[PDB]
Structures are given as structure tokens and as C-alpha cells.
């Protein structure tokens, strides 16, 4: 059990994977060309879609989850009436908070600006 050398320090067997794992070499690689996809997903809003499902994974009844979200969203707007009207939505703020409560990081209410917007009067036309 306990083993020490002359200096008095403790020497222990470094537990290491003796055998070899096939899947280890087949899964550590990452694709290099998803920069446009990840940017599109965030801009579209599918990042919340995964978060919405993730919350439902730890839930027992999806009808109770939406009632709890609606109840908490109503609580948010009552406290701060002049915050959840435009770029920030009461429901999205609840969802962002509930994800942040799990220990992950999301922007507040999933709100995103347009860094490339030229002027105040220029609104982004959508290419249908």
C-alpha cells in the first residue's frame, strides 16, 4: 500500500490505460469547415432550439415546463416593464437564464445585434 523512498516522499503507481482504445483515434479529429454553419446557426436562432430540448431532457412533463417558463416570464416583465419589449424578450430571457443556471454560457435572452449594419435607417433586407 503505502510506499516511500529515502527522501520520505510518497511514490504511487501512475494508473494508465494499458490496452489500446480503437475509438480514441477515430473521434479526436474535428472538421475544419463549419465556420459558416456555426455562424448561421447562431444568427438563425437554432442554438436556443438545442437549449430548449436540453431543458426538456431534465424535465418530467413538457406541459409543466412551459407553464413554469410562462409563469417565470410573467414574473420578469412585472418587475421590469421597460426591458422586455424589443431586442430582449421575456420568454427568451427565462430560457437563457435556465441554461445559465445549469452552468453553461449563453447571451442574455439570446439577443444578437448586427455588427455590419451600415446606418440607423438601413434595415437588413432578407434575400427570399
Amino acid at each position: 500500500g503505502i510506499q516511500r523512498d529515502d527522501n520520505g516522499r510518497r511514490i504511487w503507481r501512475r494508473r494508465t490505460l494499458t490496452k489500446k482504445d480503437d475509438m480514441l483515434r477515430y473521434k479526436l479529429q474535428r472538421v475544419p469547415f463549419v465556420e459558416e454553419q456555426v455562424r448561421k446557426i447562431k444568427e438563425v436562432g437554432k442554438v436556443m432550439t438545442m437549449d430548449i430540448e436540453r431543458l426538456l431532457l431534465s424535465e418530467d412533463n413538457r406541459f409543466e415546463f412551459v407553464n413554469s417558463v410562462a409563469a417565470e416570464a410573467t414574473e420578469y416583465v412585472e418587475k421590469n416593464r421597460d426591458e422586455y419589449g424589443g431586442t430582449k424578450k421575456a420568454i427568451f430571457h427565462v430560457l437563457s437564464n435556465r441554461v445559465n443556471d445549469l452552468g453553461f454560457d449563453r447571451p442574455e435572452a439570446y439577443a444578437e445585434s448586427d455588427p455590419y449594419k451600415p446606418g440607423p435607417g438601413y434595415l437588413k433586407e432578407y434575400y427570399t
Partner: protein, 54 residues
């Protein structure tokens, strides 16, 4: 020809991938377009350099 030299079918792309996107902004009658260029290079030249060479 054939002198025990084994040919290598080498692809000569230093730019692994490229893509462009268009953002259109309107101000009632000021239709200006914004062009986004997206460049992936294999390190043989920086994407800024590939933009100039192209």
C-alpha cells in the same frame, strides 16, 4: 516517362475552400449590398494574402 520515379497525383489548391455571402441593406431607396468573402487556406498562404493574390 517511366524511370522508376513514382508520380504523385498532387492537387494544387492552396485555398482549401472559399465562399461568399451577400447582405442587402435598404434605407427606403438606398439599396447597398455588403459582400462577405470567406477563405480557408492550408497554411501555405494567409487568407489575407489569398485575397490579394486572387
Amino acid at each position: 516517362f517511366e524511370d522508376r520515379s513514382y508520380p504523385i497525383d498532387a492537387v494544387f489548391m492552396p485555398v482549401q475552400n472559399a465562399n461568399h455571402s451577400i447582405h442587402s441593406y435598404g434605407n427606403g431607396n438606398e439599396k447597398q449590398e455588403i459582400l462577405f468573402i470567406e477563405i480557408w487556406t492550408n497554411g501555405s498562404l494567409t487568407p489575407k494574402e489569398a485575397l490579394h493574390e486572387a
